[PDB]
Amino acid sequence: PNHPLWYTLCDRYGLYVVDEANIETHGMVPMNRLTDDPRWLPAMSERVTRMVQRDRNHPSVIIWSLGNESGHGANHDALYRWIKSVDPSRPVQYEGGGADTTATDIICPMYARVDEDQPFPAVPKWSIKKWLSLPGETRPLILCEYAHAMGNSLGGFAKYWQAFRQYPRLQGGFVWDWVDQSLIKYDENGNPWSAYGGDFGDTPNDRQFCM
């Protein structure tokens, strides 16, 4: 959840908002170790329920998200249904556990390609055109993350937009991401420079992957 003023500004200037619970357990092995554990359900529930209680009156918020990169656990299913019960006015989405689980109203993959399949075990990233028509699948597809804009990037961006325009159920996506997470440091002359992972003696780190 963002600073409260953000939603007011989105209401007034006009932007659609996905409001996302503060739950990410990416570093767990496997990713759902905590989110499938009922002992962590109370802690997770508060991050979802208190978000909805705070932000539910904002017209800019059109979709609720259960968080990010936390695999798919039974706690997600429970909280998906809680939201659907208290606020039928907004779809609920969640990418974890393969982007098309029972905890999401929208197929919402991250970095699924336009034409090329990436058949990872358990959590494949299908071609987005292919994904829509998998046997029994009916949901819309909106990428929660695509076109990773790291450094000299966005090659093939036009391929996504051609597909979005051609396929009714491909309804767009969210570019990753808006702004480089670089920090300012100062040299011996006091002159500022842009710093990334490792530049503060932080270790382990992931270097320029924050930009």
Which residues are annotated binding-site positions for Mg(2+)? 24, 26, 69, 205
> Does the annotation count 116 as an active-site position?
no
**Contacting range for another protein; rule: CB under 8 A; set: 106-114, 131-139, 186-194, 195-203:** 131-139
**Contacting range for another protein; rule: CB under 8 A; set: 5-13, 118-126, 128-136, 177-185:** 128-136
For another protein, the closer of residues 36 and 100 by Cβ is: 100
Binding site partner of 136, from another protein, Na ion, none, Cβ cut-off 5-8 A by kind: another protein
Distance CA 183, CA 192 (A): 10
Task: Work out how close the CB of 137 gets to another protein at its nearest, in angstroms, rounded to a whole number.
Answer: 8
User: Rounded to the nearest 5°, which phi and psi values hold at 142?
Assistant: -135, 115
Binding residues: 24, 26, 69, 145-148, 205, 209
For another protein, the closer of residues 86 and 134 by Cβ is: 134
Binding site partner of 42, from Na ion, another protein, none, Cβ cut-off 5-8 A by kind: none
**Contacts with Na ion, residue ranges (CB under 5 A):** 164, 170, 209
**Contacting range for another protein; rule: CB under 8 A; set: 51-59, 114-122, 129-137, 176-184:** 129-137
Do 144 and 177 contact (CB within 8 A), yes or no?
no
Using CB atoms within 10 Å of the CB of residue 14, give its burial: 0 to 12 exposed, 13 to 18 middle, 19+ buried. Answer: exposed
> Does the annotation count 95 as an active-site position?
no
For Na ion, the closer of residues 102 and 133 by Cβ is: 133
User: Rounded to the nearest 5°, which phi and psi values hold at 64?
Assistant: -95, 140
Q: Is the Cα torsion angle 166, 168, 170, 171 positive or negative in sign? A: positive
Binding residues for substrate: 69, 145-148
Task: Work out how close the CB of 136 gets to another protein at its nearest, in angstroms, rounded to a whole number.
Answer: 5
Other Cβ atoms closer than 10 A to 171: 13
The region that residue 175 occupies, defined by phi over 0 for left and psi between -120 and 50 for alpha, beta otherwise, is beta
User: Rounded to the nearest 5°, which phi and psi values hold at 150?
Assistant: -85, 115
User: Would you count residue 136 as binding another protein (CB under 8 A)?
Assistant: yes
Do 114 and 141 contact (CB within 8 A), yes or no?
no
User: Would you count residue 100 as binding another protein (CB under 8 A)?
Assistant: no
For residue 163, CA distances in Å to 61, 120, 123 come to 26, 23, 22
Which residues are catalytically annotated? Answer: 69, 145
